Design a binder for this molecule. Structure first.
Ligand SMILES: Nc1nc2c(ncn2[C@@H]2O[C@H](COP(=O)(O)OP(=O)(O)OP(=O)(O)O)[C@@H](O)[C@H]2O)c(=O)[nH]1
Ligand SMILES: Nc1nc2c(ncn2[C@@H]2O[C@H](COP(=O)(O)OP(=O)(O)O)[C@@H](O)[C@H]2O)c(=O)[nH]1
Ligand SMILES: [Ca+2]
Ligand SMILES: [Ca+2]
Ligand SMILES: [Mg+2]
Ligand SMILES: [Mg+2]
Lengths: 440, 423
């Protein structure tokens, strides 16, 4: 039980999905053909890794995943790639025409033609679960499918599965690798439509990942492959508690209790360390204290913002590898006495700690050094609202002139949806301001 | 005569398992349920906690409850896991997500009836059931929410029986989630109404003891449970071995509870262990009353003792025991209320606990316990004035009014203690 279904939407979601599931197979010892010699229960089982992998009678371990894109060329690489034998053909769903970077086409014109088939395939996976826990939805903000079709899917999933939990991994746009001028529009539209249907969303700022690859890994011009392999490690750290077990393991849902004080305030900031190349990691062992200190270096954040200028509502530390509580507690004590960690006055200040003893894995030919211990911090900070402000500002600049709006109206949308979505974002920025104010 | 034990949730099942490990050793019961002791004192009152199965095998009268199987699976494969009656494992699969509402109103309601079926089957086999014994935490969801739900259902079906709990109180120093003050406040209101005796086991005190006294740099839940196991064995000695004082749950309540709502006890233990020098009766008496030996993080000098029960275990001089118990009373008589004469009762048991030749267990009904409820009340209010983390509860059908009423009744409990601290 406690199965988790992953849904990868659009190019960004699909390609990140490829990197994640490759990394999962290596962490669990699953071969590209789905075989897992260490698994002695054939056809099924209740092991921790079965939350993400189902099992066939022939010994194949199949991701509990659906890949969906409105054009086929990205998923076609999966169909012909190294892990093509990993997925059943029906898990990889493609249309013929994409959303042309237009939320309206992903949510309406083009998306409505495939939504029923997607829900049918998700249902096929859910029926195989004896205790479905929820969904993980990987998508970009800027793409027409990642924004428009995701919102449609999320709305439909709330209908078909009630309040069953839905988590997002959302790719926040960056000019260095962006492909459409209207990505601010699509970002605001999908954030507004999905807000009430998402329980927890981890935003990944492509510019933050871009800078990290340049600064920490000395990659001159990072590609999506560079970015996605780093993103995989963070996603892996977050889901490791669901896929492995241990005495000191803490379930992701338990962190969730602390990370979400109000339904709309459900955007944790993730920070990951250590990101180091093999050259620098050689003969340099990074202790628990050093990787923990790195979690409070804003340059290692997954979203560009300054927590030193906001207030904390929760701090979670997800360690993996050779880590014991003694060294964790000592490291935390040092950090509080030397960092600006200001909590809101209505939250406790303790850090919530989890430790998965399975050490991190790296994909062959990657840029990340293989380390004995890693950590991902998940904090709820008012500073993440900076990401909304930057995006909302670009929205206002274009919408004041109605620039490009005709592409959305032409597909059936109304200006009222734009203003409605923008007002919801203004209220969200306002909500993050109010929760930071001291109590009277 | 017979007591029916219930353990609910992760904490409740982990401390309950250890409890059965310890008293099984004291009564000479091996993991198979076979007796291998050298004294008849071990078997004279064994039926209080054990049913005698076929072949002269002893089975704990224990019911294991949880909304997820994880913790109970470990118990079944634990050291004494094979002794428990397989039918008495009652578990769901969804869990309670550290949510009192899930344990009390939704997830737990779906499972409670099957738990009561097991309780009924045990009670019906009792020649003269005297009451129930629940182990649980108040900071989680199952032990706190479904545990208090079970108490309410049990009281409805056995309203003339005694209800006793070992309730682990949450602490930010040993915390799993931020909503523990919510779950604890909601639970205390239930306990105030539907229990006769509650041993307040404060994880703040257990941590401080392990860290300061036992010099354990980083205490684990196992280290905390060591102290809990020793305390639970001590406070149940009078129930498990021949004796004149507090030999059953009702007589204990009559001696300890002068007012129905003020039934929250402060336990203590001496010597504190994690050593070959046996103590002296004077040393047991001083440590037993020392605040550093209390399992509820409250200073006894900040209040007054309404009643006290002291239990000495081991071969020692009863004459010297009475002299020392009268010594501490006559020297600090200001901390014992003068309107309850002779409110300190002492029992002695020849059989000491494992690993020690002498020990002492403290059970105090002190008005200083209000500091514990004050602490929970402040942590509760700090979040509730901003309605923080409440969506986890309203999503299960609860309204904010229920939180306001739980807060009010615990503040009332605090003021009622302060009433008698100045009498
Ligand atoms: N990190 C990361 N970002 C990506 C990747 N692929 C695309 N993006 C980002 O996603 C945004 C564009 O959305 P896409 O996912 O490519 O488009 P789509 O979801 O397929 O929608 P349409 O093509 O319009 O139908 C841009 O901001 C890209 O920088 C990727 O593999 N990794
Ligand atoms: N002493 C002790 N406390 C525990 C243990 N496990 C959890 N707790 C405490 O109980 C609270 C969490 O409740 P828990 O029993 O885990 O949740 P439940 O299963 O829903 O009842 C927190 O305050 C923890 O500090 C344990 O083994 N020993
Ligand atoms: Ca298997
Ligand atoms: Ca159900
Ligand atoms: Mg595309
Ligand atoms: Mg727990």
């Amino acid at each position: 039980m406690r199965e988790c279904i992953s849904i990868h939407v659009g190019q960004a979601g699909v390609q990140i999905g490829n990197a994640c599931w490759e990394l999962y197979c290596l962490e669990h010892g699953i071969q590209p053909d789905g075989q897992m010699p260490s698994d002695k229960t054939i056809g099924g089982g209740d092991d921790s890794f079965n939350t993400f992998f189902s099992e066939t009678g022939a010994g194949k371990h199949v991701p509990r995943a659906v890949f969906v894109d409105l054009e086929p060329t990205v998923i076609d690489e999966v169909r012909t790639g190294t892990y093509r034998q990993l997925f059943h053909p029906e898990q990889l769903i493609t249309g013929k025409e994409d959303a042309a970077n237009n939320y309206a086409r992903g949510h309406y014109t083009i998306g409505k033609e495939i939504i029923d088939l997607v829900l049918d395939r998700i249902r096929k996976l859910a029926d195989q679960c004896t205790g479905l826990q929820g969904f993980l939805v990987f998508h970009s903000f800027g793409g027409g499918t990642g924004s428009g079709f995701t919102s449609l899917l999320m709305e439909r999933l709330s209908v078909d599965y009630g309040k069953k939990s839905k988590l997002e991994f959302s790719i926040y746009p960056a000019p260095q690798v962006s492909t459409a001028v209207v990505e601010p529009y699509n970002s605001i539209l999908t954030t507004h439509t999905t807000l009430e249907h998402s329980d927890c969303a981890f935003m990944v700022d492509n510019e933050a990942i871009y800078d990290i690859c340049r600064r920490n890994l000395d990659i001159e011009r990072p590609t999506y492959t560079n970015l996605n392999r780093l993103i995989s490690q963070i996603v892996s750290s977050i889901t490791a508690s669901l896929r492995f077990d241990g005495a000191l393991n803490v379930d992701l849902t338990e962190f969730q209790t602390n990370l979400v004080p109000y339904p709309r305030i459900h955007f944790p900031l993730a920070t990951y360390a250590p990101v180091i190349s093999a050259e620098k990691a050689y003969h340099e062992q990074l202790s628990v204290a050093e990787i923990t200190n790195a979690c409070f270096e804003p340059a290692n954040q997954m979203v560009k913002c300054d927590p030193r200028h906001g207030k904390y509502m929760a701090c979670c530390l997800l360690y993996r590898g050779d880590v014991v509580p003694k060294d964790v507690n000592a490291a935390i004590a040092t950090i509080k006495t030397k960092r600006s960690i200001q909590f809101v006055d209505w939250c406790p200040t303790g850090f919530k700690v989890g430790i998965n003893y399975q050490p991190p894995t790296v994909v062959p030919g990657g840029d990340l050094a293989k380390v004995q211990r890693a950590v991902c911090m998940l904090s709820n900070t008012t500073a993440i609202a900076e990401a909304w402000a930057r995006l909302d500002h670009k929205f206002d600049l274009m919408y004041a002139k109605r620039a490009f709006v005709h592409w959305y109206v032409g597909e059936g949308m109304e200006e009222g949806e734009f203003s409605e979505a923008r007002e919801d974002m203004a209220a969200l920025e306002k909500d993050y301001e109010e929760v930071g104010v001291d109590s009277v | 005569r017979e007591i029916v034990h219930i353990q609910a949730g992760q904490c409740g099942n982990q401390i309950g398992a250890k409890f059965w490990e310890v008293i099984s050793d004291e009564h000479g019961i091996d993991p198979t349920g076979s007796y291998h002791g050298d004294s008849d004192l071990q078997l004279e009152r064994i039926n209080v906690y054990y049913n005698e199965a076929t072949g002269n095998k002893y089975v704990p009268r224990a019911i294991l409850v949880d909304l997820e199987p994880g913790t109970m699976d470990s118990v079944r494969s634990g050291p004494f896991g094979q002794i428990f009656r397989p039918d008495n494992f009652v578990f769901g699969q969804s869990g309670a997500g550290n949510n009192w509402a899930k344990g009390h109103y939704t997830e737990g309601a779906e499972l409670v009836d099957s738990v009561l079926d097991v309780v009924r089957k045990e009670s019906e086999s009792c020649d003269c059931l005297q009451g129930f014994q629940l182990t649980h935490s108040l900071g989680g969801g199952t032990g706190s929410g479904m545990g208090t739900l079970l108490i309410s259902k049990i009281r409805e079906e056995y309203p003339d029986r005694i209800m006793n709990t070992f309730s682990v109180m949450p602490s930010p120093k040993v915390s799993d989630t931020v909503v523990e003050p919510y779950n604890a406040t909601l639970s205390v209101h239930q306990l105030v109404e539907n229990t006769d005796e509650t041993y307040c086991i404060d994880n703040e005190a257990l941590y401080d003891i392990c860290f300061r006294t036992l010099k354990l740099t980083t205490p684990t839940y196992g280290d905390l449970n060591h102290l809990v196991s020793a305390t639970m064995s001590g406070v149940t000695t009078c129930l498990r071995f021949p004796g004149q004082l507090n030999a059953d749950l009702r007589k204990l309540a009559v001696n300890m509870v002068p007012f129905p709502r003020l039934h929250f006890f402060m336990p203590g233990f001496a010597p504190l262990t994690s050593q070959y020098r046996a103590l002296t009766v004077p040393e047991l008496t001083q440590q037993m009353f020392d605040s550093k030996n209390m399992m509820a993080a409250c200073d006894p000098r900040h209040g007054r003792y309404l009643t006290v029960a002291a239990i000495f275990r081991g071969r020692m001089s009863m004459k010297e025991v009475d002299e020392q118990m009268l010594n501490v009373q006559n020297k600090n008589s200001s901390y014992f209320v003068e309107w309850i004469p002779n409110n300190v009762k002492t029992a002695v048991c020849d059989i000491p606990p494992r690993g020690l030749k002498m020990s002492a267990t403290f059970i105090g009904n002190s008005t200083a316990i209000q500091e514990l409820f004050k602490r929970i009340s402040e942590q509760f209010t700090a979040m509730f004035r901003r309605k923080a983390f409440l969506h986890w509860y309203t999503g299960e059908g609860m309204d904010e009014m229920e939180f306001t009423e739980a807060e009010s009744n615990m503040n009332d409990l605090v003021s009622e203690y302060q009433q008698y601290q100045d009498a």
